[PDB]
Each structure stands twice: as structure tokens, then as C-alpha cells.
Amino acid sequence: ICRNRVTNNVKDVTKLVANLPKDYMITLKYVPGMDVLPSHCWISEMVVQLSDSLTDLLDKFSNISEGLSNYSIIDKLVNIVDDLVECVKENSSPEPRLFTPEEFFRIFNRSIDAFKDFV
Amino acid sequence: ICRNRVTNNVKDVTKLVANLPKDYMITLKYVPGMDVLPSHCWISEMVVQLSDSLTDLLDKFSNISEGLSNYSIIDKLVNIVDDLVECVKENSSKSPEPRLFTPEEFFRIFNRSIDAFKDFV
Amino acid sequence: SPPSIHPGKSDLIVRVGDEIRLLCTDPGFVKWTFEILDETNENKQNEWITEKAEATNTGKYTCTNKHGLSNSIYVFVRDPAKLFLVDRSLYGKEDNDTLVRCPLTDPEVTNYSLKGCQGKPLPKDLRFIPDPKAGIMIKSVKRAYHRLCLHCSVDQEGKSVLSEKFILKVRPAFKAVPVVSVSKASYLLREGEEFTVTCTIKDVSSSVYSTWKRENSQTKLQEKYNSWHHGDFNYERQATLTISSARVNDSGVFMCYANNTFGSANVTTTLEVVDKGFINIFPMINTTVFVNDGENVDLIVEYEAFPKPEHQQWIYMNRTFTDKWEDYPKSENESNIRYVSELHLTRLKGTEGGTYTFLVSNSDVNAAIAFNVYVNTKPEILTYDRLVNGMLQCVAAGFPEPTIDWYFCKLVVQSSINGTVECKAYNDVGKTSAYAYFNF
Amino acid sequence: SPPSIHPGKSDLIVRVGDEIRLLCTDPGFVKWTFEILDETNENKQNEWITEKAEATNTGKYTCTNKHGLSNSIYVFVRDPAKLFLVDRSLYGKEDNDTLVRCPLTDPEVTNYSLKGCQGKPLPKDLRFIPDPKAGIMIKSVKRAYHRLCLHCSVDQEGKSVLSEKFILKVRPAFKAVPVVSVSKASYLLREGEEFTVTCTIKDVSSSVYSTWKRENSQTKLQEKYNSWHHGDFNYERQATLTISSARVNDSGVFMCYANNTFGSANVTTTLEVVDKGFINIFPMINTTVFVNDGENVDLIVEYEAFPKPEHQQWIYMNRTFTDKWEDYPKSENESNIRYVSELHLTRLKGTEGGTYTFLVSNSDVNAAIAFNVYVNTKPEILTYDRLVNGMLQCVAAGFPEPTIDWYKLVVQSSIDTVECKAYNDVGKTSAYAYFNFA
Numbered sequence A: 001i002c003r004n005r006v007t008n009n010v011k012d013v014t015k016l017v018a019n020l021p022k023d024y025m026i027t028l029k030y031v032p033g034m035d036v037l038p039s040h041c042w043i044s045e046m047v048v049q050l051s052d053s054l055t056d057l058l059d060k061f062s063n064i065s066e067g068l069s070n071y072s073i074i075d076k077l078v079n080i081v082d083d084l085v086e087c088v089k090e091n092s093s094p095e096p097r098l099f100t101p102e103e104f105f106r107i108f109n110r111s112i113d114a115f116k117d118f119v
Numbered sequence B: 001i002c003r004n005r006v007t008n009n010v011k012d013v014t015k016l017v018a019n020l021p022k023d024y025m026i027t028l029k030y031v032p033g034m035d036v037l038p039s040h041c042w043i044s045e046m047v048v049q050l051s052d053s054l055t056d057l058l059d060k061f062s063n064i065s066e067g068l069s070n071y072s073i074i075d076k077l078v079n080i081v082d083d084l085v086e087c088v089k090e091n092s093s094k095s096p097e098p099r100l101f102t103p104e105e106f107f108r109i110f111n112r113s114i115d116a117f118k119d120f121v
Numbered sequence C: 001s002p003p004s005i006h007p008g009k010s011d012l013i014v015r016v017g018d019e020i021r022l023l024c025t026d027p028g029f030v031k032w033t034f035e036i037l038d039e040t041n042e043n044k045q046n047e048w049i050t051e052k053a054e055a056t057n058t059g060k061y062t063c064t065n066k067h068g069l070s071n072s073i074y075v076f077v078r079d080p081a082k083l084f085l086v087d088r089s090l091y092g093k094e095d096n097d098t099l100v101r102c103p104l105t106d107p108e109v110t111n112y113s114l115k116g117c118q119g120k121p122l123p124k125d126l127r128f129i130p131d132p133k134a135g136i137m138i139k140s141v142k143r144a145y146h147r148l149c150l151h152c153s154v155d156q157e158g159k160s161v162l163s164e165k166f167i168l169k170v171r172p173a174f175k176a177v178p179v180v181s182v183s184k185a186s187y188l189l190r191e192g193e194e195f196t197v198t199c200t201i202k203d204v205s206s207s208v209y210s211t212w213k214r215e216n217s218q219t220k221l222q223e224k225y226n227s228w229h230h231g232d233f234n235y236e237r238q239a240t241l242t243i244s245s246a247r248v249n250d251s252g253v254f255m256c257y258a259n260n261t262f263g264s265a266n267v268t269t270t271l272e273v274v275d276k277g278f279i280n281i282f283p284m285i286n287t288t289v290f291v292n293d294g295e296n297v298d299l300i301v302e303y304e305a306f307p308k309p310e311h312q313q314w315i316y317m318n319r320t321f322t323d324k325w326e327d328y329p330k331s332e333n334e335s336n337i338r339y340v341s342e343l344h345l346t347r348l349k350g351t352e353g354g355t356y357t358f359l360v361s362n363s364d365v366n367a368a369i370a371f372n373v374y375v376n377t378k379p380e381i382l383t384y385d386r387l388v389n390g391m392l393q394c395v396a397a398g399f400p401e402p403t404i405d406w407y408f409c410k411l412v413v414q415s416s417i418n419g420t421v422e423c424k425a426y427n428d429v430g431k432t433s434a435y436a437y438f439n440f
Numbered sequence D: 001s002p003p004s005i006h007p008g009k010s011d012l013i014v015r016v017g018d019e020i021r022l023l024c025t026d027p028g029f030v031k032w033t034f035e036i037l038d039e040t041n042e043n044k045q046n047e048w049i050t051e052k053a054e055a056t057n058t059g060k061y062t063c064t065n066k067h068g069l070s071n072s073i074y075v076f077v078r079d080p081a082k083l084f085l086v087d088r089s090l091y092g093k094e095d096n097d098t099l100v101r102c103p104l105t106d107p108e109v110t111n112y113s114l115k116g117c118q119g120k121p122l123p124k125d126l127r128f129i130p131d132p133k134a135g136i137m138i139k140s141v142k143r144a145y146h147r148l149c150l151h152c153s154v155d156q157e158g159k160s161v162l163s164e165k166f167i168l169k170v171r172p173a174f175k176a177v178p179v180v181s182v183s184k185a186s187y188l189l190r191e192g193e194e195f196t197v198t199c200t201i202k203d204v205s206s207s208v209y210s211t212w213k214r215e216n217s218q219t220k221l222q223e224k225y226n227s228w229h230h231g232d233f234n235y236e237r238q239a240t241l242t243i244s245s246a247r248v249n250d251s252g253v254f255m256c257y258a259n260n261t262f263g264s265a266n267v268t269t270t271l272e273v274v275d276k277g278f279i280n281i282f283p284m285i286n287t288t289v290f291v292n293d294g295e296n297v298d299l300i301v302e303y304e305a306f307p308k309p310e311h312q313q314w315i316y317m318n319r320t321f322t323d324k325w326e327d328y329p330k331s332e333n334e335s336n337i338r339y340v341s342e343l344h345l346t347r348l349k350g351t352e353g354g355t356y357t358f359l360v361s362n363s364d365v366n367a368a369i370a371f372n373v374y375v376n377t378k379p380e381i382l383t384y385d386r387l388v389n390g391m392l393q394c395v396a397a398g399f400p401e402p403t404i405d406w407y408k409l410v411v412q413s414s415i416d417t418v419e420c421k422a423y424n425d426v427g428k429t430s431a432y433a434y435f436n437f438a
């Protein structure tokens, strides 16, 4: 359940993480110990927070029509995590912390890997 | 002179500016008064400082195989500036304090520096 | 009765870091409740106090007795910095009202209203109702507003002040059915072949249900998926059905069914699985044809062939015939397993009659059909003689066999009986004559 | 005789924030001069004194007189805070030593050496010579060191310390000629069409030089350029000539030429400009043709046509054909103006002898060649008849003309079992009479 919500534009996250500067900082109210706790415990809060952070990231870029801009990739990821908010709320704060792209997208892919396993 | 050395990978700059985050800051030892002054005095220092900044900025990105990537575009711009330095040091042939720029402002400065080489001495 | 509550106000206004102190009395009294946005606190005392109110203390307070009845007082903490409380989540079901949770923390302010970000003016028809206690509400959200950005806006000391920034999310109403299409409407396969068909489903949202089911079989089939969002309100799914080893009774109607909260749409594909290949041949003309010498004729066959026909050849009298024959699939359709082969004999000479054969094969079968071409030819007269018997001889050779008529005053016919005496030899194509003169 | 300095010592070491005092004893004294990295100072007093040294006061101090005789001191301001002064533009030319500008502020240290970024090792064959007063020098910079990045490393108190990154840029030295190719080996244009050819030059560097020359003319042609960098040591330039409106005298050879410090390549294209289009036609067989009854023949023309021919048709006796003729260019190559036209005639009937014509047109010109085709036939015997006089006559119709013997062109032969037989080079046919007398 909610697995079919997550389209496979997530497979573009690695191309996005390649184009974001190592130095850049992305901001995410991070549910403490989600790296440890079972999926059903954090996942509801995390998917709201990710939807927010990704829309902030979406403000930062602009829409290069030729090729895959970061704007296009992040846009389609916002479409995903918003639909995950929609199903989690239908079917079922922390303190802001600062992540480099590789770290923030680690958390993103872990959250999305929770839905292949959800209740 | 040195109009040949600036290859047309520069048109990519508009895309690079669009893929860099608006609030990302880039650091350049900007020659003060570069705006108002004639080309010849600031252009010699600026191609050096642009080569430095663009090389550091190049380190920050990975290299995708498919498509255009910031690392590809910046790598080609770095090739340009490292040639413009090679000619300026060899045809004129006779630091500022670091300042921080959003990508659109840094690339404004870059594009003005390259527009300096459409009538140099 | 519900509890009475002290102070007896409806609203109650307090400067930040003042004291908030609310005194409740029902003899049945059970508990307070405090609500703002999501946040809630619950307190079992019949008195509620905090010595230094923060802006967040803004909110509604309800005191409830054991008899079930409730009385409420609503509180503001006026604060120059945090004028709005906010929750940045903002989702609307399209065509429903939605709420922008920016409730005020000082109600005595002017023109509580909604504004676009970056200066931009709101969409021409977006209309809203404000409420200091709850927020601002947006009547009849519609798809044009998707990711509209918003600010809540207050005028205080004649100056105009804006909330943290909000992005509206719209969640489609489904107003048209899905759109469904399949990579091939009909399949034909040798047994034991792989079978693979792909269905495309398009809709405004990824919550479109879609399945592959086999008609007159209720159980749903094994499937692998790929989907994409393609920009706002544009989703595409591709669902793929595979049988690794087909078999005859794996034939049937397969259906790609897709529906949504408006209504379904489906598209079927039909599978034929054959136990072994075939060729079937039809001659477009009788297998025996008759041609007057020096005319063209065509020999034409049409045939069904599966798997596709590998060799095609036309042979005459135990020898192949080339550069005068043409062949094409009968129809352009992908379903068409049917093929045409034609051979253009030209200006046929009288010697070229006899059999012409067409041979076609695939892996499974080798198939033949044969044509007999008879070339009619105007008679010719060979000999004119008289026998030892005192009898006259006229001799003519033609296909069809000539016919000989006498007057007095390839196949061969030899024909007999102050005078001139004539024999005439003729068939369906040709008329010819030879003469003898007898003088008495 | 030259200057002399107090302190005498060739090398001096001063603590940070210590005072620096140098005095040069010369009746002819002119200046102190101080150099480190690019920075320079020069001072008029015979004493140079500085109240509190900073690390950047490290360097070389030279005393010089009116003779121009000079004497030098080098000064190390030991500052525990930074061991290196750096000057971080590290360009090097290929095949040439390249200095890494990380002179030391304390000479009293060990193992001053050069080391990669992020704990990556240096390339194995890279070697270097260290020098506290100047930096660390990389010998014989190769292309494999392009964008190699480097730290300068020094062991102090048994503990190893690194400078800010250096990134080694490499200006390639040319070891092969530029590589040159042109979009078309040769051109043909109707006068007033627009010639436009595009060279392509490929080299390791954008300082390859390339030009377009009209052969036997020294003057410069107009041109437009595009060029790209395809990764490291890979540059490509495209240079496009245009003559905006071709005139006849523009016919000639153009050369695209490219040279670098190593050598030269040129590649050439030749332009023909024709004042008006043309067609020329050659029959691959005599225009007069002979065929027997039932025989098979082809008719074949080769023709050179510019512009490319637009209507090709074959007509027999003023009545056009279809489905019996093949048309193809004679060669594949993109410089092709020459074409082949064939018509095939099958088992020709006797009546079909006549004249066959081939008609081809382009915008400029319309041209015809005509073929005369004679179907020979076996003599065929038309009348055998016995006339009132007692004579009997035979008639035969043939091409070539029949000859008649007793035992199209038309022949009749007359006489007072008899047989008539008519022969020409194709065949024989014979007709019969039988006679009895009393």
C-alpha cells in the first residue's frame, strides 16, 4: 500500500545529487532516531517534512527546458512525496537540521524505501 | 586577439546559472572598480581570479555520464579561462580581497570578462 | 448546564509575557482543553494559569464537565514579532474549500487578507474568507492554483505585514476517466514462446487503479510497472504482462482495466497460441489457364503463413524462374499473416506451356501449389500429299487440336478425302488454308 | 667592490613579532630590494629595519650600489601559525619543470615534500626537487598530471603539516600536426547559387591556427567560426567559408590550412561554377538496333546532367512508356552528376519495330536521344493462288526482305507437289499446292 504512489522518477535522485554542490546545505526538520526506529514510527512525520524541504529546494532552481534541470527532477520528487503525504493521511515538530545533498538524499531514499514495507 | 582562445562552450553558462541554486554563494577575489574601469587593467587580474574560482567550484560537483552536468560545463569553462590566462600572460606580457556572489552575479562578472576579449590589445 | 467560565468574555487579549489565568466552575467539572492549529494541551485542574504567556498560547480553551457540556474562552497573545501563527502545510482537494492556517495573535488589525509571493498578484478569481481564530479560507480551489504561493497579510500601525510563505497543493478531482492503450491489439505465437504486452494508462493522479485480468477468469495477473509524472496533473503508468512459456490454453482475451473515482476504461488484447506453424494457400485463379500465344498472363497465389514465410520461389519445368515475380504482404496491418505472390509471364511463346509451381516454407511446413499453363497457338499446316490409295492428305498442328474442313467444285491432325480443292484448319485462335488442283 | 651587510649571515631566522634589522655598508649604496613570490619592495635607506615581523616578511633582501654590485640576505620569519607562504596559480607547460610556490617560513624542519589531495597518492613516476627559499619543483610535467592536485607537506615536531590545495594545470606541447577534414571534397554550382564549405580542425589546444585560402590568391576570405572543447587535450574548430553569391570566376581550389608549433596540415576543396545548366547524353549502343521475332533487347543511355534531372521518360512512336525502364545514378559518391537510363523490351512483336526516344529535362535544358529499332521476322507467306492464265503466285512479308524459292517488306513472285518457301536470315516458312493432270 502506497507503493504504487511512488513513481520511478526517484531513480533520478542520483543524477540530482551529482548536480548539487557538495558544499550546499539543505534544511530538514529531522525526526530523531529514524535511522534506528521502525518505519511506522517516524515515517508519517518525515514525509511531511521532506515534502516541505523539497519545495524549498524547488524555489532555488530555474526551468532549463533543454535537458534535465535540477528544477525538473526536484519538481517530480515533490509530486511524489506530496502523494505519499496524501496516502499516509488517508490510509493510516522536530528541530531543523542541516544536511549536504548526499546526506539529505540518503534520508529521502530511506524514507521512500519505507513504503515498499508499509502498513 | 585571443578571440580564438575563447571557445563557444560559453553559451552553456546560461544553463549552468539556471542549475546552480539561487542562494548558493561563490567566492571571487573581485578587482574593485572592475565595473567602471576600462577593460585592459582589470582583465589581466580577473582571468586569473576567475580561473581560481572556477577550479574550486569545479571540485564541488560529481561527473554524470548521461546528459549535461554542472561538472561538464564548468570543466569546459575552466579550459577556456586557463587558455585566456595563457594568452594574456603572453601578449600583454609586461591580490584583491575575496567577495561572495550568487551564481547569477558571478556569471555576470564572468561574461563581462569574456566580453573583454572581443576588442583587447 | 455547561460550566461557567471566569473571565466571562468570549475573546480575551493579553500582552506577551503577561499572565493567563482562567477560572472554571461546574460542580461536575472534568478537564480543560487547549487547541491551536494541530497542537493541544489538556489540564485536569478547575483553574488554568501560566505566568508568562508566549505567542503560541494564542488559542481556544474549553472547560468540560462530567455531564458532557462545555464552555469556551478564546485567547490572544499580542506580540510585535509573531503576528501570525502558521502551519506551512497547505493542501486542497480541487473544487473544495481549503484553509490557510495563519491565525492571528492580535485581532484588532485591519484588512486581514491574502497575497501572492514575490509581489505577484493573485489569480484573477481566487476568493477567500478570513477569520482571526482559524486562518483564511479559499473558496473552490482549482487546478490553476497548483503551487500558487501565498502570504497572509495584516495592517498594523498603518504598515503592511506578511506571514511566512505558503504553497498551495491541489489534489485533483477526477473529472474524466483514464486513458488506456496497449502495444498490440492481437498476438499470435508458437507454443513455448515468450508473450509480452504493455498497457499504458494516463491520468491526472497516481491513485488511478489499473490491473491486467484475463476475461472469463477473475484472478488478476502478474505484472511489472513503470510510471512517470510528466509535469503537473499528468501521470503515466505502463504495466507489463508476461508469460515466459506460452501454451495453447494460454490463448484468450487479456484486458487492461483502469479506473478512478470518476469511472473506468479498459482495452483488451487477444492472444492466439498455435501448437505448430502452418501455411495455407489459395489460388486466385483456376489452377489451369489458357493463353493465346504472344499474350501476357499472371499466376497469383495468396497464402496464410506463420511463422513468417522464409523461402518463396517459382519454378517452371524443374527449373527456377526469376526477375519476373513480385510478392508483398496482403495488408499493411500488423495482424495480417497473409501474403500475395504473383508471377508475370509475358508474351508467352507456344513452347512454354505446361506446369508452373510455387513453393513456400517456414520452419514448421513446406507448401506447394501448381499451375498448368496451356498456350493456344494458331494452327500451321505441315504437309500436303496424296497417298498411294488415290486419297488426299492435309495435316495441321495446333493447340487446341486443329479441325479440318474440305471444299470441292501442340497437337496434330491428319485429315483426308476440272477441280480446285481446299482444306481449312482452324481453332479458337487461328485460321489457315492450303490448296490442291485436279484437272480432268 | 660590492656591498657588505650586517648581519653577515647568508640565512637569518627571526621569530614572529621580532624586529628585523639589516644594515648595508656601501659608500656607493643605492637601494635595498626585497622579493618573495610576486611581491616586491624597494627601500632607499642604507638601513632596512622592521619593528615587528609578520610571516609575509619572509623572503630575500638584496643590497645594491651605484656600480650595480649587489649582495643578498634571506630571512626566515619562523611563525608556528603558517609554515608555507603560497602563490597558488600553478600553471606548467608540458615537458617542462614547474614550480609549486610554497616557500617556507621556517627552514629548521624536516621532510619537505609534495603529496596528493584527499589522501590520494601522487602518480608513481612524478618526481620533484624541494627548495625552502622558492618552493617545490615538479620535473617534466606530463599530460597525465593535468588537474592533478597537490599539497606541500612538511614534518614539524615529528608531525606532518599541509598547505592549501594546488591544482596543476598543463599547457600541452604539440607532438602531432593538426588534423583537418572538409565537408565536401568538391563542389559544382549553378552561377548564383551559394558556395558554403565547412572545414574541421582537431588538435590538443585552441592555439592551433587555421585559415582558408583561394589557391594562387594571397588575399583573405570571409569566414565564421565555431569551436568546442571535448574533454582534456581535445579541441575542435569548425570554420566555414561562404561565397554569398557564386560568380563564374570563383571556380577554383580552396585550401583549409592548419598549423601549430609542431607542423602543418592542409586539405582542399575545388569549386566549379557553371554559367548555365547542361545535359549531355551518350548511348551505350548504336542508335540503330536490330532484334529478331521473340528476341530480347535493352536500350541504354548514359548522360551527365546538372542540375539534377527532373523528368525522365521514354516514348515509342510518340506514345510514352511505364513499368519497363530503370533509372539510377552511375556512381554512389556525393559528387555525382552522371546518370544511367535503361529501357527493356521483351520478346518484341513484329509490328513494334520503329523509333524509340528518350527525353530528359532539368530546369536549364531539355535533351533528347532517339533510337531506331527494327524487328526482323521470319518470312510469313500471305497468298498462294493460281491465276486465270495458269500462273501461280507466292507472296511473303518479312524484314529483311524475303527471298523466295519453289520446289515488313513484301515480295511477290510469279510462275507459269509444288511448294513455296520464303527465307531470310531469321527463318523459313512455306506454303503448299498439289497438282494432278489428265
Ligand SMILES: *[C@@H]1O[C@H](CO)[C@@H](O[C@@H]2O[C@H](CO)[C@@H](O)[C@H](O)[C@H]2NC(C)=O)[C@H](O)[C@H]1NC(C)=O
Pocket (backbone or CB within 6 Å): C209, C259, C260
Ligand atoms: C475501481 O477499481 C476497483 C476495481 O474493481 C474497485 O475496487 C473494488 O470495489 C469493490 C466494491 O467496492 C470491492 O468489492 C473490491 O474489493 C474492490 N477491489 C479493490 C482491489 O479494491 C472500485 O470500486 C472500482 N469500481 C467502482 C465502480 O468504483
Ligand SMILES: *[C@@H]1O[C@H](CO)[C@@H](O[C@@H]2O[C@H](CO)[C@@H](O)[C@H](O)[C@H]2NC(C)=O)[C@H](O)[C@H]1NC(C)=O
Pocket (backbone or CB within 6 Å): C257, C264, C265, C266, C267
Ligand atoms: C470494457 O470496455 C468496454 C467499452 O470500452 C465496456 O463498455 C461496454 O462497451 C459496449 C460497446 O462499446 C457498450 O455498448 C456498453 O454499453 C458498455 N458496457 C456498459 C455496462 O455500459 C465494457 O463493459 C468494459 N468491460 C469491463 C469489465 O469493464
Ligand SMILES: *[C@@H]1O[C@H](CO)[C@@H](O[C@@H]2O[C@H](CO)[C@@H](O)[C@H](O)[C@H]2NC(C)=O)[C@H](O)[C@H]1NC(C)=O
Pocket (backbone or CB within 6 Å): D209, D259, D260, D261, D262, D263, D264
Ligand atoms: C604557422 O602559421 C602562420 C601562418 O602562416 C605562420 O605565421 C606567419 O609566418 C610568416 C613567416 O614566418 C610570417 O612572415 C608571417 O608574418 C606570419 N603570419 C601570421 C598571421 O602570423 C607561422 O610561421 C606558421 N609556420 C609554421 C612552420 O608553423
Ligand SMILES: *[C@@H]1O[C@H](CO)[C@@H](O[C@@H]2O[C@H](CO)[C@@H](O)[C@H](O)[C@H]2NC(C)=O)[C@H](O)[C@H]1NC(C)=O
Pocket (backbone or CB within 6 Å): D257, D264, D265, D266, D267
Ligand atoms: C598541402 O598538403 C599536401 C599534402 O597533403 C602537401 O604536399 C606535399 O608537400 C611536400 C613538400 O612540402 C612534398 O614532398 C610531398 O610530395 C607533397 N605531397 C603531395 C600529395 O603532394 C603540400 O605541400 C601542402 N601545401 C601547404 C601550403 O601546406
Ligand SMILES: *[C@@H]1O[C@H](CO)[C@@H](O)[C@H](O)[C@H]1NC(C)=O
Pocket (backbone or CB within 6 Å): C247, C249, C250
Ligand atoms: C491449461 O490452463 C491452465 C491455466 O492456464 C494451466 O494450469 C494448465 O497447465 C494448462 N494445461 C496444460 C496441459 O498445460
Ligand SMILES: *[C@@H]1O[C@H](CO)[C@@H](O)[C@H](O)[C@H]1NC(C)=O
Pocket (backbone or CB within 6 Å): D247, D249, D250
Ligand atoms: C571576378 O569577377 C568580378 C566582376 O567581374 C571582378 O571584379 C573580380 O575581380 C573577379 N575576381 C577574380 C579573382 O577574378
